[PDB]
Design a protein around this ligand. Structure first.
Ligand SMILES: OC[C@H]1O[C@H](O[C@H]2[C@H](O)[C@@H](O)[C@@H](O[C@H]3[C@H](O)[C@@H](O)[C@@H](O[C@H]4[C@H](O)[C@@H](O)[C@@H](O[C@H]5[C@H](O)[C@@H](O)[C@@H](O[C@H]6[C@H](O)[C@@H](O)[C@@H](O[C@H]7[C@H](O)[C@@H](O)[C@@H](O)O[C@@H]7CO)O[C@@H]6CO)O[C@@H]5CO)O[C@@H]4CO)O[C@@H]3CO)O[C@@H]2CO)[C@H](O)[C@@H](O)[C@@H]1O
Ligand SMILES: OC[C@H]1O[C@H](O[C@H]2[C@H](O)[C@@H](O)[C@@H](O[C@H]3[C@H](O)[C@@H](O)[C@@H](O[C@H]4[C@H](O)[C@@H](O)[C@@H](O)O[C@@H]4CO)O[C@@H]3CO)O[C@@H]2CO)[C@H](O)[C@@H](O)[C@@H]1O
Ligand SMILES: OC[C@H]1O[C@H](O[C@H]2[C@H](O)[C@@H](O)[C@@H](O[C@H]3[C@H](O)[C@@H](O)[C@@H](O[C@H]4[C@H](O)[C@@H](O)[C@@H](O)O[C@@H]4CO)O[C@@H]3CO)O[C@@H]2CO)[C@H](O)[C@@H](O)[C@@H]1O
Ligand SMILES: OC[C@H]1O[C@H](O[C@H]2[C@H](O)[C@@H](O)[C@@H](O[C@H]3[C@H](O)[C@@H](O)[C@@H](O[C@H]4[C@H](O)[C@@H](O)[C@@H](O)O[C@@H]4CO)O[C@@H]3CO)O[C@@H]2CO)[C@H](O)[C@@H](O)[C@@H]1O
Ligand SMILES: OC[C@H]1O[C@H](O[C@H]2[C@H](O)[C@@H](O)[C@@H](O[C@H]3[C@H](O)[C@@H](O)[C@@H](O)O[C@@H]3CO)O[C@@H]2CO)[C@H](O)[C@@H](O)[C@@H]1O
Ligand SMILES: OC[C@H]1O[C@H](O[C@H]2[C@H](O)[C@@H](O)[C@@H](O[C@H]3[C@H](O)[C@@H](O)[C@@H](O)O[C@@H]3CO)O[C@@H]2CO)[C@H](O)[C@@H](O)[C@@H]1O
Ligand SMILES: [Mg+2]
Length: 755
């Protein structure tokens, strides 16, 4: 380009910067094409064009001005890129602000979508504020290839669509531009199918929705409602390996953590809305907004010391009792708790306080509700038409057709959507088996095999691989967590090694061993020592997340205290011993709200947590316990650097089943960070109990779950102990310990202590 064209951009004289900025074709070769990307990045010294799906990166060069950049790239198609922008010591990675010159669908958009490869389809499908023919308005577009007609109905035409009939393009997508309406417009699509029957649909790609049970979509100007402050958090995430960090997750259902009074409005970020009553049976209570949750949940979690919050599904969902797992509005955060900008604020505030956000994401099915995706255009559009692969009959839901390109694209782009517009740090996918198996909860004769005669749902496996491949490429450093309950291999290994591509998997076997173990009367635990140690046999086949989740404190399973045998003191002691063991055992950590303060009753999604219990000392002490355990977790590298390497763990001894005692080492990069952990899983203390240790010195008591400030009886080693030169458990040195009752000790050699 010429210096005069550059100067016209720099001094804001240019008539249309899209002519020059963004991506433009320079020429066609035989097998490839040559493109230029340009950007004006005031305050950037350097920049790069990332092609994350091709694994390439190209530097940009300054041209005529130090902040005007150009990059020439040869490739057949330049559809998927990002800009990396360096301003002083900081980098950010963004989509090109000049990627799309128009609000309407181009031929390229339609072609990529038809192939299932439009990573940003939600920039053009749904409803967006823009300008067409010189007039400001909203562009609507919806995929519905077998509809006979579609119209936009809404507040602006009194729900009569006759003069807002949409125009069909390439036999596949309906569009319409409506002048002079803007954000806040309430609308649906009125679809006529092949039979002539008329229905009303929420926008599949809608960005906001009325409060359940109403279902009209609402137009949002999603790039102009919130200003973020988390560049530094995002840069740090992109540059780190989250597998080598502490990850302690507080799992939360937003609708039932804490309620407010329905006698007042719900405050929002600079505004307010009517209260959303939690149910007709409990009309005095309302949900808290995302804004109120940012003000109360976030400091509560920060002060507990968790590194992440994991949310049960916040995509829009019509029925409270699904807990979120039956979604019909995939592209909108639930209006139960306010507006999209309120949830953006929530995320931004987590990031400011050093907390990541993991979303439960539900690509596995969707319910039949008629406002939603079902039978969308009068055909089996989103769901497979054959109920043997297209319905989960036991659940009453429909299963997406993962092999259909536009359906795959709906979901692939959806996962990217949450990382792009809402800045989240990970996803967790529930019930992955339900997607992977063609015979899932289906009896003989009621499913069919894949094309090779197997049970593998080939299209689902392929979809899942694509999700994880693209997620990590576009947003490196995130968490992608699977719960998969049948022994499928390599769930949390790279797609290039034959894996499904997650980086963490819930260790469901471990959860069952532990909760079955601690439920057994302590005298009988000697017959079940294997529960304590079995999971370390297959542990290195995946990267495990140790999760004690919501699903384990409902439906008559009891909350944590209630699972435990004995009197009140022993119930608390068992909870502390179990969780000290969970936090010292290899793997990342997840626990669910209410577990951290000893709620007696099961989680009940129609009320909120029993916060009044925190008036009383026992509950306060257990909460302090978790507060201190989380701090210890972040402070001791051997609890997190080598979770997934042999070096990070070794049993010292586990043959004392008779006393239900086990002991082990944790290690990190530095040998002086090594820990010794000793567990006593009966209420019988032991007085001069020897444990081998690998070196001489003074082993400081870092943590003792029987300390009185945790509710314990206060037995212990008085702060530490000198090792003896007394071979034991095949080790040259040994500690002669007091083992407190129903308790775990964590010890660390201080090699600078003087004898
Ligand atoms: O994560 C929470 C928290 O955990 C740790 O802190 C805990 C401790 O783990 C826990 O034991 C306790 O320690 C407090 C203690 O309560 C305070 O009284 C004080 O301890 C004093 C002690 O009072 C002084 O006497 C002095 O101790 C001498 C001791 O008098 C002397 O006899 C000898 O002891 C040896 C003893 O003779 C042996 O028989 C044996 O003793 C065993 C018994 O065999 C056993 O049957 C059972 O009853 O317990 C005895 C204790 O092991 O071995 C003894 C060697 O240990 O030598 C000692 C050497 O001093 O000194 C200390 C002053 O240090 O302070 C301690 C330390 O705080 O409560 C705390 C908190 O609840 C962790 O330290 C902390 O960081 C964490 O926050
Ligand atoms: O109006 C003229 C034509 O209309 C009719 O064809 C329709 C079908 O009824 C629609 O359902 C649709 O079909 C698309 C489909 O939507 C799309 O996903 C893609 O299908 C792929 C699939 O994703 C992939 O997994 C694999 O199985 O291959 C499939 C076939 O390519 O493409 C379909 C075909 O276009 O759209 C058309 C057009 O509206 C009518 O049946 C035609 O005979 C008629 O000419
Ligand atoms: O000198 C004090 C004693 O030190 C050691 O006693 C231990 C027990 O061995 C441990 O099991 C534990 O005791 C728990 C006990 O397991 C539990 O059931 C509960 O018992 C209380 C009960 O809550 C209370 O309401 C009332 O019934 O009295 C019971 C007191 O026994 O709580 C106990 C702890 O408070 O810890 C103690 C103290 O460390 C040692 O083994 C004893 O020989 C010694 O006497
Ligand atoms: O009470 C007086 C005695 O107390 C002390 O003995 C303790 C040990 O210090 C503890 O380590 C433990 O002993 C365990 C041992 O740790 C464990 O490995 C297992 O020992 C098996 C062994 O693994 C196996 O190879 C084989 O050789 O048999 C061993 C004996 O069965 O189980 C042991 C406990 O049964 O607990 C004892 C107390 O029971 C002190 O050291 C004693 O000298 C003292 O008399
Ligand atoms: O104050 C007027 C009115 O506002 C609210 O009703 C709105 C609905 O919540 C909203 O869904 C929409 O209803 C349309 C349906 O979505 C559509 O499928 C079809 O059946 O037409 C409806 C419009 O007639 O609009 C209504 C009206 O704004 C509030 O909930 C009402 O009770 C209230 O009276
Ligand atoms: O080096 C082999 C192995 O050593 C350690 O594994 C021990 C287990 O952790 C422990 O549970 C036990 O395994 C037995 C099971 O408990 C039982 O249910 C059944 O399947 O038999 C198992 C056969 O041993 O003992 C093993 C072997 O010591 C360590 O934890 C591993 O990481 C390590 O690879
Ligand atoms: Mg309540």
């Amino acid at each position: 380009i010429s210096a005069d064209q550059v100067n016209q951009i720099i001094y804001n004289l240019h008539h249309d910067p899209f002519e020059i900025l963004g991506c433009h074709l320079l020429e066609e070769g035989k097998n490839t094409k040559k493109w230029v990307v340009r950007a004006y990045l005031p305050k950037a010294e350097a920049a790069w064009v990332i092609r994350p799906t091709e694994r390439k990166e190209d530097p940009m060069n300054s041209v005529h001005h130090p902040n005007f950049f150009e990059c020439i790239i040869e490739t057949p198609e330049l559809n998927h890129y990002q800009l990396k922008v360096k301003e002083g010591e900081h980098e950010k990675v963004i989509y090109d602000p000049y990627a799309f010159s128009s609000p309407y669908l181009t031929d390229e958009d339609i072609y990529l979508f038809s192939e299932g490869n439009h990573h940003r389809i939600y920039e053009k499908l749904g409803a967006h504020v823009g300008e067409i023919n010189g007039v400001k308005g909203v562009y609507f577009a919806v995929w519905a290839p077998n509809a006979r007609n579609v119209s936009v109905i809404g507040d602006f035409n009194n729900w009569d669509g006759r003069e807002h009939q949409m125009r069909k393009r390439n036999y596949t997508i309906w569009e319409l531009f409506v002048p002079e309406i803007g954000s806040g417009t309430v609308y649906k699509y009125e679809i006529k199918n092949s039979e002539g029957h008329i229905y009303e649909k929420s926008d599949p790609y809608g960005f906001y929705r009325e409060v359940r049970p109403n279902t009209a979509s609402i137009v949002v100007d999603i790039d102009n409602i919130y200003q973020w402050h988390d560049e530094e958090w995002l840069e740090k995430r992109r540059n780190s390996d989250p597998l080598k960090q502490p990850v302690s997750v507080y799992e939360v259902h937003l609708g039932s953590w804490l309620h407010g009074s329905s006698a007042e409005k719900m405050p929002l970020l600079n505004g307010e809305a009517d209260p959303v009553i939690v149910s007709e049976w409990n009309p005095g209570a309302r949900f808290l907004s995302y804004y109120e949750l940012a003000e109360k949940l976030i400091p509560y979690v920060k002060d507990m010391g968790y590194t992440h919050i994991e949310l049960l599904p916040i995509a829009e969902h019509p029925f409270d009792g699904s807990w979120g797992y039956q979604v019909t509005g995939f592209y909108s955060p639930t209006s139960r708790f306010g507006r999209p900008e309120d949830f953006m604020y929530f995320v931004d505030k987590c990031h400011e306080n050093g907390i990541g956000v993991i979303l439960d994401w539900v690509p596995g099915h969707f319910p039949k509700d008629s406002h939603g995706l079902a039978y969308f255009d009068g055909t089996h559009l989103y769901e497979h038409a054959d109920p043997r692969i297209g319905e989960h009959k036991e659940w009453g839901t429909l299963v997406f057709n993962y092999g259909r390109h536009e359906v795959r694209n709906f979901l692939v782009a959806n996962v990217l959507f949450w990382f792009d517009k809402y800045h989240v740090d990970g996803i967790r996918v529930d019930a992955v088996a339900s997607m992977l198996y063609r015979n899932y909860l289906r009896k003989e004769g009621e499913w069919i095999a894949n094309e090779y005669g197997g049970d593998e749902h080939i299209e689902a496996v392929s979809f899942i691989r694509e999700v994880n491949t693209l997620l990590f490429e576009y947003f490196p450093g995130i968490l992608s967590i699977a719960e998969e309950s049948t022994e499928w291999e390599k769930v949390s290994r790279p797609v290039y090694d034959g894996g499904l591509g997650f980086n963490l998997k819930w260790d469901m076997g471990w959860m069952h061993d532990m909760l079955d173990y601690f439920n057994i009367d302590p005298y009988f635990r000697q017959y079940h020592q294997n529960n304590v140690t079995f999971s370390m046999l297959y542990y290195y086949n995946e990267n495990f997340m140790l999760a004690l989740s919501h699903d384990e404190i409902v439906h008559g399973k009891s909350n944590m205290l209630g699972k435990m045998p004995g009197d009140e003191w022993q119930k608390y002691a068992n909870v502390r011993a179990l969780f000290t063991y969970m936090y010292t055992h290899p793997g990342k950590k997840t626990m669910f709200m209410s577990m951290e303060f000893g709620q007696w009753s099961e989680w009940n999604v129609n009320g909120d947590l029993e916060w009044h219990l925190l008036q009383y000392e026992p509950h306060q002490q257990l909460k302090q316990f978790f507060t201190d355990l989380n701090a210890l977790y972040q402070q001791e590298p051997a609890l997190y650097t080598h979770d997934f390497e042999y070096h990070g763990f070794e049993w010292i001894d586990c043959n004392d089943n008779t006393h239900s005692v086990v002991s082990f080492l944790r290690r990190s990069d530095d040998p002086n960070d090594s820990l010794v952990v000793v567990c006593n899983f009966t209420p019988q203390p032991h007085s001069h109990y020897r444990i081998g240790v690998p070196e001489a010195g003074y082993y400081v008591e870092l943590f003792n779950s029987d300390a009185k400030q945790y509710g314990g009886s206060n037995m212990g080693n008085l702060g530490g102990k000198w090792a003896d030169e007394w071979s034991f458990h095949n080790k040259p040195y040994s500690l002669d310990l007091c083992l407190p009752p129903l308790a775990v000790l964590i010890l660390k050699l201080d090699p600078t202590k003087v004898p």
